[PDB]
Design a binder for this molecule. Sequence first.
Ligand SMILES: NC(=O)C1=CN([C@@H]2O[C@H](COP(=O)(O)OP(=O)(O)OC[C@H]3O[C@@H](n4cnc5c(N)ncnc54)[C@H](OP(=O)(O)O)[C@@H]3O)[C@@H](O)[C@H]2O)C=CC1
Ligand code: SF4
Ligand code: SF4
Ligand code: SF4
Ligand SMILES: [Zn+2]
Lengths: 104, 182, 89, 186, 114, 89, 65, 135, 377
Amino acid sequence: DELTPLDSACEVHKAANWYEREIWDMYGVFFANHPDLRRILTDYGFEGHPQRRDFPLSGYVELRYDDEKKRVVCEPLELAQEFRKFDLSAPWEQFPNFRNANPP
Amino acid sequence: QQTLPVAEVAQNLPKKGYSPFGTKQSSVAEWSLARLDDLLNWGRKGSIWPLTFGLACCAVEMMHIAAPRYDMDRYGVVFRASPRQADVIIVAGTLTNKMAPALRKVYDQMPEPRWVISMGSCANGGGYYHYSYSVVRGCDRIIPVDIYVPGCPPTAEALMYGVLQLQKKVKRMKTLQMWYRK
Amino acid sequence: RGDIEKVTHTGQVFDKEDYRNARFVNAKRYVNENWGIKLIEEVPPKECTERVVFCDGGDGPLGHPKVYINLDKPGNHICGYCGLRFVKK
Amino acid sequence: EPKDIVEVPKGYVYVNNKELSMEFADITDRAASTMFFGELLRGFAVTLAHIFKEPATINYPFEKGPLSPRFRGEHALRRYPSGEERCIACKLCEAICPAQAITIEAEERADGSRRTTRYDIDMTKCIYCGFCQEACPVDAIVEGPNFEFSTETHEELLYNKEKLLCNGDKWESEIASNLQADHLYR
Amino acid sequence: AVQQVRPILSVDREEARKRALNLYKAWYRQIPYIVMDYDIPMTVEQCRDKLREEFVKHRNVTDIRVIDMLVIKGQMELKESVEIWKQKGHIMRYWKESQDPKPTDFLSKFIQGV
Amino acid sequence: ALRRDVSPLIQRIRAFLLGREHNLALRFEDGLADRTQPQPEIPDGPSHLLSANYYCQRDGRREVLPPIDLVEQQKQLKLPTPGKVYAWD
Amino acid sequence: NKLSGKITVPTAVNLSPISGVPEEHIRERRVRIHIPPKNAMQSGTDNVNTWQIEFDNRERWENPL
Amino acid sequence: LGINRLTKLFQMVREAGGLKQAYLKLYRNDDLKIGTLVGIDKYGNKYFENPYYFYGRNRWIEFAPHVNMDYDGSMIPAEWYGWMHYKTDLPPIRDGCRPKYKWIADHSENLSGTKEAYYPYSTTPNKVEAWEPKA
Amino acid sequence: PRPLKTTNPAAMKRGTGGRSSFNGIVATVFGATGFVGRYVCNKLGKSGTQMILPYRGDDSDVIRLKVTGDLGQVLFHFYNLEDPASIRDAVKHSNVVINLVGRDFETKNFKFKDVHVNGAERIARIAREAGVERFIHLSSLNVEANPKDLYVKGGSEWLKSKYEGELRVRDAFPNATIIRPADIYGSEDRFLRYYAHIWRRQFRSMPLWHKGEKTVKQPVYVSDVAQAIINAAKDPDSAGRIYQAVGPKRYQLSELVDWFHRLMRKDQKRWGYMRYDMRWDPTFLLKAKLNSFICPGTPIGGLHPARIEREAVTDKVLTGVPTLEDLGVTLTTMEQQVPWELRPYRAALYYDAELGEFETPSPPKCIEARDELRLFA
Ligand SMILES: NC(=O)C1=CN([C@@H]2O[C@H](COP(=O)(O)OP(=O)(O)OC[C@H]3O[C@@H](n4cnc5c(N)ncnc54)[C@H](OP(=O)(O)O)[C@@H]3O)[C@@H](O)[C@H]2O)C=CC1
Ligand code: SF4
Ligand code: SF4
Ligand code: SF4
Ligand SMILES: [Zn+2]
């Protein structure tokens, strides 16, 4: 879950070290015994883990540049053209084989 | 929209002059300041030094232009690594949030007169990643862009065509001639 | 300037007191000179014998998908895709 | 040739198994190479030589090219041989456009025909992928061959239908050529 | 409505405070260095004041596990400020000085739109 | 008389300096293909066969099954090794 | 006296602070758990077998440009 | 030395029109080559091809004289564009199979940074009608 | 009941606030490429406002302002103050105009009259004919109907011109808002760059009129001035009201400069700050006169005599004349702003002495009303 931690493969395969950092950044799945759980991809001071499916595609904030402050500031989101989804849902079940198979 | 003149119209017309200002100057000061602007623009136009920022995918075209097929130093363009010695910055690739402050810092550490070419769609308007939580939608939101080279990436011809367009902009800039009015 | 006066065939002119006019103080307002409505009007209505004709508009695979248009009605019949016009009489 | 150092089976080639001989002629060769930089001399003469190859720089914009008939560049909305707009607002081009750079709003012209009112492309979001033209069922929109469309202002890139129609009118001859070349082949 | 579940770090609310207050030590002790290192307007007293409010940001956290994570985030951000990976923009982010506090009373909302 | 080459002297020295017989690299119209070509016909496919060509008896997407549980497979019913041993050595 | 450090905690653990959503959205926005409506002029009904959640419309204006 | 190369220089330099008419051509194009008049453009341009050179150099253009030094990449017209890119091997003078419709415009440059520049604008008449108190 | 101007919903306020929400304001900002233009325009863009940014310099001087607004929010219109036709064109569609025009020194193409009053009225007349709802002007706080110089004779023309600009602008426009600051301190500002630049300094001895101990100054921060401009532009009920724009706490120039040099680390052992009397030394004036006469552009460090008279002049506020608090603008104090502001100019970290452990620069101390009455006796 999003709360309980998870075992670390750093002690098993040295290859995984960066991956655990990646999932931690991208989902928030803690890893126990991981040497250093620093974020990898997202920028510094980024709040939330975007790869979750309860996270808006465009994020909550976006950056610009200030002249009063000679610096780049994060601002609430503001989109020139709101991302137009398309509802691509099948009305007709195209696959019977998976219908009742794998039931509880 | 306008269109090119036709053969006979060209025949009537004279030479289009060289200095884009023209040669209609009234007095000695006007005529003199016209020439000095022309010399300045000629210097800044002939020798222009990109900074080679080149973050991504677009960068490969930014290298092919240096390559020997559409030679760019042929035009007087050289890749100086140090921004203090670079006169132009070809921002190319996506601008992520981690990069935004870096681009800003690099830009203003460069001394002016500084011109920016926004190569590729990723820099122009965020390109294909426009609705992303981590990308600066365009690079107009960090720095003042001067020339836009559409493409994904732009074919090398397109890029250095834009360079020539920047040269034209560098050619017609009015600094001394119009200081005289200031 | 006429550029910011012309009526786009879609039917838009910025109102005479509308701030969105300002964007053209220094740039042209492109408006196209060929209006499809006028052009197709000029093209005369082709005529045939058979109750049902077929149009592709263009030619071969360079036009729109082949469509069959019945002409039994007295009037004209406009091709859905290309706007060509048919009349059997 | 010197013997190997690891015996190799097929489906492989070891690029270092060759042994560095200790034969006196072999050591003195290497020693002389270092004492008089023979290898540098070989490379030195190469670059001298390769001055005498003619550079392959195209004298752009006078000389220029080459491209191919399929090149994906400036967008254009074509017109029938009568001059009528080809687009019928089927909106597939928008539905497929990976960058969602296309916006369309269509209604009935007074004649009762299904036609667009607004047709917009943002070539700061377009990727010039060509999925739009591969999808359009009447070849209404095409990746015209122009690629020197460079603007000083970002606003100038957002094309609307008027701009797109103008490009179609301007480039119609060339686009006709390519399609005649590729329609039966695409 | 209880669940018999794994821990993360802290087994009791008091250990949680022990960890949470350890972080408060690092942050309090760090503030002067960042005032020096990061050329930003903020002064020590303001940085200290914000640190107080930003812990008060979540006072009524209750679960042992949730408070553990909040500390995990803090230990991270501490290190990112301890070492200078962050940037002057990133550090100032805590103030949100680009946007004016938007209207809040009903008329100001009403007269300024939804 | 065929390709722009430096004068014969420089050619000979150039071959000397390189140490390999040189062959030209720039692409000439003569060298490359007939740059305008006849229209190609793409041969028709084997599923475009005109009869006995039912989709139902050749489709894959409707053929794939869900994953099977191996233990439960056995419940329905040479140390094993994942595959041929490879001497990655 | 332990099962690898297992602990007894309430099942319902609010995660608003750790989540990262700004409190503005959390405090001014609702959610409308429902089943997606069946399209009127369709007849297959294998896209309305799931329970769906979304957030109330806020606003949409038009870009002046 | 000059193995029938100075001879070739004499051809291009002299028949150019003298020292002045070789220097101005060189001064403008940064190179002087020999070809044949493939076809004269409608807009004063002149196209030259010579298979002696290679694909980069195969075909080239001498822009209209009245463009003093303001040459541009877009000056090529539509009917010649394909040939100029090695995109069609059929000179427009030779293939009259291309369309000859009426509505076709005439060419235009990258009109940018000038009063003639395009600028976008909404192409949808307004959506919702306001109530009119007078009526 | 305040009437409305336009009933086109496209031309009508909308959005959530930000770089996209159109605020129903269309503004031209004359003199946008200035010390305060940047702060105004950035504020206006933050609102999501349409700008026309007229300019007379090379557009490259202004291209940076393009970064202040989303697409199409900013247009650059070349004009000249001497071309009324251009100004008419720039204001036709506009809803508001702000007059940030005006130099500190005199030019060869403009005498303080023609640029500072005659041009302003022409702008206002053209604006009024164009039917522009709101007009804003700036006039120094020290404005006097009958200026009297204090140290150098020909150094009060700026003040005379400022009075002339106000009255004629009010004459040619019924209800414009004439905000009135004085000595705005900010980044890239006349105020702090002047007191920092080298030519202003003598060897190590800043010359101040009466040792800078007979002067009261009340500077205000630039953004707070800008934020006031927008807030008074959004409100039309401010129309026809002067506003004395001043900071929170008055100060004595000696207090400021000493604090400045403390901030700059200019006073530890060796740099050796001293304060003269400008009257005692007759060299400072020559520096100003020569520096004016030689520099073609703006004189180095703004050393022209008019700046010298400005520092000499005191800051006389008046009651009844509204203020920033009336405009609902909180005022960042110097104590919050200036330290960071001058951080770039800190220097003098000698090897001979100690650094770092030197205390934070102890702030200055305000001057109260009776304490002022002591000062002036
Ligand atoms: N400390 C101060 O400066 C004070 C401010 N004020 C007033 O506030 C306004 C802004 O102050 P500030 O920005 O610091 O002053 P600036 O010297 O920085 O003037 C800024 C703008 O004024 C323009 N300007 C000057 N002359 C002309 C002219 N003939 N035509 C067109 N533009 C001209 C300049 O245009 P360009 O740069 O392109 O040449 C520049 O863009 C001023 O008008 C001033 O009277 C009042 C009290 C004190
Ligand atoms: S614009 Fe296209 S070529 Fe450039 S970085 Fe983006 S995807 Fe790559
Ligand atoms: S796919 Fe073609 S016909 Fe359909 S809307 Fe797009 S351009 Fe028009
Ligand atoms: S080329 Fe691709 S991205 Fe561009 S408009 Fe067409 S479909 Fe969209
Ligand atoms: Zn048809």
